[PDB]
Every structure is written in C-alpha cells, then in structure tokens.
Amino acid sequence: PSGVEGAAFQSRLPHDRMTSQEAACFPDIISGPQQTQKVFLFIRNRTLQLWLDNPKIQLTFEATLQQLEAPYNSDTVLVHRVHSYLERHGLINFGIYKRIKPLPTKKTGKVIIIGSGVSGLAAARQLQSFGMDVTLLEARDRVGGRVATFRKGNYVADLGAMVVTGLGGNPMAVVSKQVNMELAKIKQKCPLYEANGQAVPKEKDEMVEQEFNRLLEATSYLSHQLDFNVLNNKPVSLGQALEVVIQLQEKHVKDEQIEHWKKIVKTQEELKELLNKMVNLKEKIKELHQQYKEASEVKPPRDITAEFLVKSKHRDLTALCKEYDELAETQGKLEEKLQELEANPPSDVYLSSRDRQILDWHFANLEFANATPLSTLSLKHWDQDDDFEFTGSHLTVRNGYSCVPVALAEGLDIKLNTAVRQVRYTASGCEVIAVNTRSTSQTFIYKCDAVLCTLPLGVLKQQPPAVQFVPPLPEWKTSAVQRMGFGNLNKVVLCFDRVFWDPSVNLFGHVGSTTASRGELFLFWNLYKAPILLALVAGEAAGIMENISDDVIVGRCLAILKGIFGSSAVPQPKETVVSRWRADPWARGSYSYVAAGSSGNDYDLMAQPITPGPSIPGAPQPIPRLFFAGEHTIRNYPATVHGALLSGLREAGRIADQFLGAMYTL
Amino acid sequence: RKPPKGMFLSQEDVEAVSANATAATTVLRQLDMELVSVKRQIQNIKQTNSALKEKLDGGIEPYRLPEVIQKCNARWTTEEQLLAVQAIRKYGRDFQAISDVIGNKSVVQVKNFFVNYRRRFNIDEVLQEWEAE
Numbered sequence: 043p044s045g046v047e048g049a050a051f052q053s054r055l056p057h058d059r060m061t062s063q064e065a066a067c068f069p070d071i072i073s074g075p076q077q078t079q080k081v082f083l084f085i086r087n088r089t090l091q092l093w094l095d096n097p098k099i100q101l102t103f104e105a106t107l108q109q110l111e112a113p114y115n116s117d118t119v120l121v122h123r124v125h126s127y128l129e130r131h132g133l134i135n136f137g138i139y140k141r142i143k144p145l146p147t148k149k150t151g152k153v154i155i156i157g158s159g160v161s162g163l164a165a166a167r168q169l170q171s172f173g174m175d176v177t178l179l180e181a182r183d184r185v186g187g188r189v190a191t192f193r194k195g196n197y198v199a200d201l202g203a204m205v206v207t208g209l210g211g212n213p214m215a216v217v218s219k220q221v222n223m224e225l226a227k228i229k230q231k232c233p234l235y236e237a238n239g240q241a242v243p244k245e246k247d248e249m250v251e252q253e254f255n256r257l258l259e260a261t262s263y264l265s266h267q268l269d270f271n272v273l274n275n276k277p278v279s280l281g282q283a284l285e286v287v288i289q290l291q292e293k294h295v296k297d298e299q300i301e302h303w304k305k306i307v308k309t310q311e312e313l314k315e316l317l318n319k320m321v322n323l324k325e326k327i328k329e330l331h332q333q334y335k336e337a338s339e340v341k342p343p344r345d346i347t348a349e350f351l352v353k354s355k356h357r358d359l360t361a362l363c364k365e366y367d368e369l370a371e372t373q374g375k376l377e378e379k380l381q382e383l384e385a386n387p388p389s390d391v392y393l394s395s396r397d398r399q400i401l402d403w404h405f406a407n408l409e410f411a412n413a414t415p416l417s418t419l420s421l422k423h424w425d426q427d428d429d430f431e432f433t434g435s436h437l438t439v440r441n442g443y444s445c446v447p448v449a450l451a452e453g454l455d456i457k458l459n460t461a462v463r464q465v466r467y468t469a470s471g472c473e474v475i476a477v478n479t480r481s482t483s484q485t486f487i488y489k490c491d492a493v494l495c496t497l498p499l500g501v502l503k504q505q506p507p508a509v510q511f512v513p514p515l516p517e518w519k520t521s522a523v524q525r526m527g528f529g530n531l532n533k534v535v536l537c538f539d540r541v542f543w544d545p546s547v548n549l550f551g552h553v554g555s556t557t558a559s560r561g562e563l564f565l566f567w568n569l570y571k572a573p574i575l576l577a578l579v580a581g582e583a584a585g586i587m588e589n590i591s592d593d594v595i596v597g598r599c600l601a602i603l604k605g606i607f608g609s610s611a612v613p614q615p616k617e618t619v620v621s622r623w624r625a626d627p628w629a630r631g632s633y634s635y636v637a638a639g640s641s642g643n644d645y646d647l648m649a650q651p652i653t654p655g656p657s658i659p660g661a662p663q664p665i666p667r668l669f670f671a672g673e674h675t676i677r678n679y680p681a682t683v684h685g686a687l688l689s690g691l692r693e694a695g696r697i698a699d700q701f702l703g704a705m706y707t708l
Numbered sequence: 709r710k711p712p713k714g715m716f717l718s719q720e721d722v723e724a725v726s727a728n729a730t731a732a733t734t735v736l737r738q739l740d741m742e743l744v745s746v747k748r749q750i751q752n753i754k755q756t757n758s759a760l761k762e763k764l765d766g767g768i769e770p771y772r773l774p775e776v777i778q779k780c781n782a783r784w785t786t787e788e789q790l791l792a793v794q795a796i797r798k799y800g801r802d803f804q805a806i807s808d809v810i811g812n813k814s815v816v817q818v819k820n821f822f823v824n825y826r827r828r829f830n831i832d833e834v835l836q837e838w839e840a841e
C-alpha cells in the first residue's frame with residue numbers, strides 16, 4: 043500500500059475501519075453516523091502519514107492541523123482528540139525524535155521500571171516524554187537485555203536478536219530511520235550439506251523440503267478438520283501430530299504395495315486355473331488323436347458306422363483344437379498383463395534414511411524458529427500469530443543490534459548492576475527492593491506510584507523465585523506463567539582472519555546424523571563485514587550443549603566446517619563466543635512459545651495489570667499498581683524485538699491514562 | 709476441506725495409530741508381514757505355474773489335422789443320410805457338429821433334413837435316445 047492508506051497499514055491498522063481500541067476512546071464517533079467515522083479515519087491516517095514521512099522530529103498538534111484541509115481541518119476538537127490518542131499510544135512520536143517543546147517543567151507521578159530490555163526502554167522513553175518520573179533498574183551492566191551484541195576489534199556479532207522480519211508495518215522500520223543501523227537483506231538461498239560433508243543435490247533438496255511443507259499442512263488439517271487436539275487427556279503437540287502423520291504416510295505406502303501384489307496373485311491364479319484347464323485338454327487331445335488314428339487305419343472299403351467313426355472323431359478333434367487355441371490365446375494376454383504389473387510397482391519407501399535425515403534439518407529449522415522441541419509447541423495454536431506477518435525481505439543488523447537499545451537508553455535514569463529482589467505494592471503505593479549485583483549485602487529501596495515489570499518469562503517462572511511479590515501474584519496470573527512456554531536457543535560466534543566460505547551466501551545448513559541431534563550446529567550465518575561465521579544450536583540440542591565446554595563446542599564446529607570446505611581451508615579461529623541463555627540468570631531462556639495446553643489467550647493474561655487490595659477495609663477500590671510488558675505479553679507479536687518494543691509502548695500508554703488522566707476520551 | 713494431495717489421512721485411520729502407545733508400530737508390523745506373506749505366496753504360484761507350462765511343451769502341434777476344404781451340396785447320397793442319422797444319435801441338435809461331420813452340408817440343409825426325413829428315420833425316437841444319455 044501507499045498514500046494515506048499506506049500509513050494505516052504501515053502502522054498495523056485497517057485504513058477503512060475503526061479498531062476496538064478506537065471504539066473505546068471515541069465511542070461517540072463509532073456509534074455515530076458513517077459520515078463521521080470516515081472523517082475520523084482520514085484524520086488518523088493523515089496524521090500517521092505525516093509522522094511517518096519524517097519520524098526524526100516530534101509532530102505537534104499545530105504542525106498537524108496545519109497540514110490539513112477542510113472538510114477535515116474544520117472541527118479542531120476532533121483533530122486534537124485524534125492527534126492526542128495517537129501520541130499517547132505511541133503510534134506517533136515514539137522512539138528517538140527531536141522535541142519541539144523542550145520538556146514541561148516539573149514532573150507528575152513516579153514509576154519504577156524493572157529491566158532495561160527494549161520493552162523496558164521503549165516504555166521508559168514514552169513515560170518520560172509524557173513528563174513522568176522514570177527510573178529503570180537493570181541487573182546487567184548494560185542495556186538491551188536479550189539484544190546482546192559482541193564487539194571486539196572489528197568483530198561484531200549479535201548473540202541475541204539479529205533478524206528484522208521485514209519492514210512492512212514494522213515499528214522497527216521507523217526506529218531504523220531514527221538510528222543508523224545498516225540493514226542488509228538475507229539472500230534466502232541456503233545450501234544443505236549432509237553429515238559426510240557433501241552438498242545435497244537440487245533433486246533431493248527439493249523433494250524433502252516440499253514434503254516437509256506438505257507434512258505441515260497435514261497437521262493443520264488434522265487439527266482443524268479432524269479435531270485431533272486432545273489425546274487421553276493431554277493436549278497434542280506439533281511433534282505428535284507430525285509423527286502421527288508420517289506414520290500414516292508410511293502406512294499408506296504399504297497399503298498400496300499390499301494391494302498391488304494382491305493384484306498380481308489374483309492374476310497369477312487366473313493363469314494357474316487356465317493352465318490346468320490347458321493341460322487337461324492336451325490330455326484329451328493326445329489320446330483322442332490316438333483314437334482317430336486307430337479308426338483311420340481300418341482301411342476302406344468300410345461300412346457306414348466305421349466311416350462315421352472316422353468322420354466323427356475328426357470333428358471331435360478339430361473341435362477340441364479350436365478350444366485349446368482359444369486358450370493359448372487367453373494365456374498370452376494374461377502373461378503380458380503381468381510383465382505389465384511387474385514393470386510398475388508402486389513406491390518402495392515413504393522416505394529413505396537420507397531423506398528422513400534431511401527432513402530432520404527442516405524440523406530443526408522449525409525448532410529454531412520457535413526456540414523449542416516440536417514436542418512442546420501447541421498443535422492448535424503454535425502459529426496463532428500467523429496473520430500479522432510483516433511484508434518485505436528479512437534483514438540483519440550489519441552493525442550489531444545493540445546500536446538500538448543503547449540509542450533508546452540515551453537520556454534516561456538507568457541503574458545498572460541492580461538486581462530487583464522484592465516488589466511490594468499496596469493501595470497507596472509500591473516499594474521495590476533491589477541489591478547490588480557486585481556486593482549483594484548493599485541494599486536499595488525504591489518508592490513509586492507504579493511498577494512496570496519487564497522481567498523475562500523465564501525469570502518469572504523461576505523455582506524458587508528470583509523475585510518475590512508482596513503480596514503474591516494472583517493464581518490467575520501465576521497459572522498463566524506455568525502454562526506458557528519459554529524456549530531456548532544458542533549461538534556460536536566464530537571469528538576468523540579470512541573468508542573461506544562462499545561470500546555470496548548468507549546462510550548454509552549442516553545435516554545431523556540423528557533425529558536426536560538435529561539441532562546441534564545445524565546452521566551457519568555469514569552476516570557481517572568482518573570474517574565471522576555464526577552457528578546455531580536449536581531444539582533439544584541447545585539445552586544439552588549448555589553443559590559442554592566452549593572448546594569442545596568450537597571443536598565440533600570446526601569439524602563440520604572442514605567437513606564441508608576442506609581440512610585446511612579452515613584456520614583456527616582468532617576469537618570465539620558461545621551463548622548460554624537458559625543458564626543466564628537474567629533470561630533463563632531465549633523467548634516464549636505457545637506450549638501445548640496454552641493459547642494466545644495466556645499472553646493477554648500476562649499483560650493484565652495488578653490491583654492491590656484495600657488498605658483500611660471498606661475504603662474505595664484502588665488504582666492498579668503493578669504493570670507488565672515484554673515479549674511474552676503481546677498476543678500478536680510474541681517472542682520478538684518489535685514485539686517487546688510494542689508492549690512497552692502499550693504499557694506506557696496505559697500507565698499515563700491511569701496517572702495523568704485521559705483528556706482525549708471526552 | 710481436503711488434505712494436501714498425496715497425503716493420506718482417514719478419520720478412522722487416525723484413531724487406529726493412537727489407540728495405544730505402539731498401535732503405531734503394531735499396525736505397521738502386521739502389514740510388513742501381511743506383505744512378505746503375500747510375496748512368498750506369489751513365488752509358490754510362480755513355480756506351480758512354471759511346471760504346468762513345462763507340460764504344455766511343444767503345444768498340441770503334432771496332433772492337428774490338415775484342412776478339409778469341401779464345397780456344400782444339394783444331393784443327399786444314401787451315404788450322407790446314414791452319416792446324418794448317426795450324427796443325430798451322437799450329437800442331438802448340434803446342427804453345427806452334425807453339419808461338420810457330414811462334411812458338405814450347410815447348417816440348415818441339416819435342419820431341413822430334420823423335417824423332411826423326420827418321417828422315415830424315426831428322428832423322434834432317435835432324438836429321445838440321445839437325451840437318455
């Protein structure tokens with residue numbers, strides 16, 4: 043899309059319909075007359091457009107109304123209502139802009155933000171921009187959290203997020219104009235290489251892949267059409283579903299072979315009967331010729347009965363030769379209608395051991411995508427976010443994604459090396475107790491009106507708790523923490539003094555020997571300006587590799603690589619790094635997934651803020667005090683940077699509405 | 709609507725590979741045997757048939773009789789009439805065979821005969837006697 047409707051789309055909104063969100067702030071308009079809705083929609087779209095066309099400077103109500111025409115710039119309470127909702131909810135003036143009206147004088151309310159993740163930062167910025175008093179508390183000694191970037195000399199590699207999944211309606215697209223990130227595209231071309239170290243022929247490469255995709259839809263069919271969703275009380279995983287399909291595929295392979303030879307027999311046995319009938323005819327015929335011979339020897343002149351005998355047997359014989367000729371006829375047809383059946387057996391196997399191995403790499407890719415064993419993903423929901431796809435080619439950050447959280451960080455009150463330990467929230471405020479990560483006896487107390495919690499889900503799951511809630515989180519919330527999945531995925535950074543891979547190629551896969559190790563070093567990335575190869579560890583493997591030393595790992599790594607490129611095209615690496623996210627105490631994993639027995643709905647639960655009980659009982663129902671953001675909290679953009687970033691914008695909006703009031707819902 | 713084409717998935721099939729923990733490898737193993745079992749029987753009847761083809765060796769070639777190209781005729785020689793009357797006793801109503809035996813009469817000349825001489829060859833009696841066998 044382009045024009046004004048471009049903006050609506052590039053902002054994740056229907057250009058010609060009002061959202062549930064908007065309904066709530068403009069209930070006057072939407073219950074209103076069709077004509078007004080259209081005016082509204084345009085104003086929105088148009089403002090968005092303006093912001094979008096230039097997101098390096100703040101966009102004021104003046105500057106906005108300024109660029110409008112009648113009939114539109116007629117009503118200005120509308121324009122204000124609109125520009126103001128858009129501002130609040132971070133559709134316009136989010137990220138890094140230049141403020142036209144340097145920040146209003148004294149600040150209102152105070153919020154503690156746990157963790158300077160992207161979700162953390164993006165919210166902090168928003169709040170501060172709304173003139174609130176914001177402090178972030180970070181356990182690590184750097185910002186970004188799961189946006190980690192390795193830097194040393196000229197080597198630059200992300201150990202955390204690394205891919206931008208397309209600019210089409212991606213908030214990061216704005217951010218990218220605001221910050222210098224070199225975005226390189228990802229040539230989707232990816233050659234595979236079996237265990238031996240030999241490329242896989244385009245002939246196979248394509249068979250397997252296509253079968254993979256076929257297998258996927260298959261599961262989708264079992265799910266939605268056959269309703270195969272529970273199974274002796276447990277929910278079905280993608281994993282099960284896949285097996286159950288593969289099995290059925292193998293089954294039908296046999297089913298065919300059976301009824302194919304089962305046809306050969308039924309025919310071979312027709313041939314049998316006919317041959318028997320044929321022998322027993324040569325039998326009569328043999329000994330009936332005898333009789334004609336004997337009766338033909340009686341030399342004439344013969345009387346008439348003896349003449350009749352000759353004449354008669356001679357018919358009776360040519361009669362039986364007719365018969366047997368018609369049978370050797372029939373015989374011939376069947377004998378060839380049998381080289382026919384032996385010529386085209388149906389298929390011998392469903393997949394060879396080499397096939398079913400490559401198919402495994404395709405599953406590894408899927409385990410990588412979801413940071414988890416397919417045995418754990420929900421069948422029904424594993425891909426519930428499947429509509430909200432961005433458009434455009436996927437990209438990478440050529441200069442390390444960290445360039446972003448660092449840029450967001452700028453101008454904010456951040457306490458690094460500060461491990462939150464207890465969150466206490468009550469009717470009249472909250473206090474947060476952190477310690478110093480370096481010397482942990484050294485304690486801190488933070489008082490504030492609201493707490494925004496951007497703790498990773500992994501952290502939130504810890505048993506026993508790394509952070510204590512006072513009072514405890516309601517059971518509706520803590521079940522949503524159990525139920526949800528929090529996966530794992532690990533990277534290996536290989537730094538060299540020379541390129542020795544195909545420079546024209548961004549990614550290439552390695553095919554493991556067993557199902558069990560399909561994830562182990564299954565895929566490599568050539569991404570950066572320096573000679574750095576980056577290798578993945580996904581699936582069941584990632585968890586196990588965390589227990590293995592770095593040398594051993596880089597070992598198995600170089601192996602595989604020599605295996606493909608020749609045992610002396612591959613030098614020792616100058617510099618290596620190995621992530622361990624499930625180990626890392628401020629992550630406890632990589633990003634969330636939709637575990638079997640969860641649904642997208644749990645994500646909505648994660649986002650529901652907490653409202654304490656009353657102080658003096660029988661006093662009025664309080665304000666909500668404890669708020670949540672982070673990749674695990676955004677039903678429609680789970681597990682991503684843009685997703686977090688968005689969840690931050692969300693909560694900031696929600697908190698401002700709460701503590702600064704909403705002048706725009708009038 | 710329909711499973712991707714070339715994938716096979718029956719409602720009924722599914723419940724069958726799930727019934728227990730290894731109804732999976734069970735059902736896949738019946739067929740593995742159900743096969744080698746058909747496949748063995750194929751070689752039995754391959755050999756059984758092969759030995760029968762052994763007997764039919766050389767066909768019926770030495771037993772075939774030369775061609776009788778002889779033209780149909782009006783006259784019933786007394787020879788032909790007797791040949792006829794005996795054919796009837798042996799063949800009943802198979803006017804084709806009867807015609808074939810007398811050599812040179814049309815399949816109808818025969819039926820005609822059946823009504824003309826019916827009289828004096830007691831073809832009634834004759835015919836009911838062919839039945840009595």
Ligand SMILES: [C]C1=C([C])[C]=C2C(=[C]1)N([C][C]([O])[C]([O])[C]([O])[C]OP([O])(=O)OP([O])(=O)O[C][C]1O[C](N3[C]=NC4=C3N=[C]N=C4[N])[C]([O])[C]1[O])C1=NC(=O)[N]C(=O)C1=N2C(=O)[C][C]C1=[C][C]=C([N]C(=O)[C]([C]C2=[C][C]=[C][C]=[C]2)[N]C(=O)O[C]C2=[C][C]=[C][C]=[C]2)[C]=[C]1
Nearest residue numbers: 157159160161181187188202203204205431462672673683
């Ligand atoms: C780990 C990781 C790695 C290694 C990598 C990656 C990742 C991860 N990811 C994720 C991210 O990173 C996340 O999410 C974020 O970052 C988060 O944020 P937040 O929320 O904020 O959180 P944090 O950061 O953590 O923060 C926190 C804080 O806090 C703190 N603490 C703790 N504790 C404490 C504290 N403080 C105080 N106290 C206490 N106590 C800490 O420290 C911190 O700071 C990612 N993402 C992205 O975006 N990208 C990337 O690249 C990444 N990475 C990778 O590699 C991969 C992953 C992924 C996934 C996914 C995606 N996408 C998607 O999904 C979409 C979907 C769809 C589909 C269809 C349709 C529609 C939609 N798209 C697509 O396309 O798909 C497919 C695919 C898959 C895969 C791949 C490719 C493609 C992306 C990515």
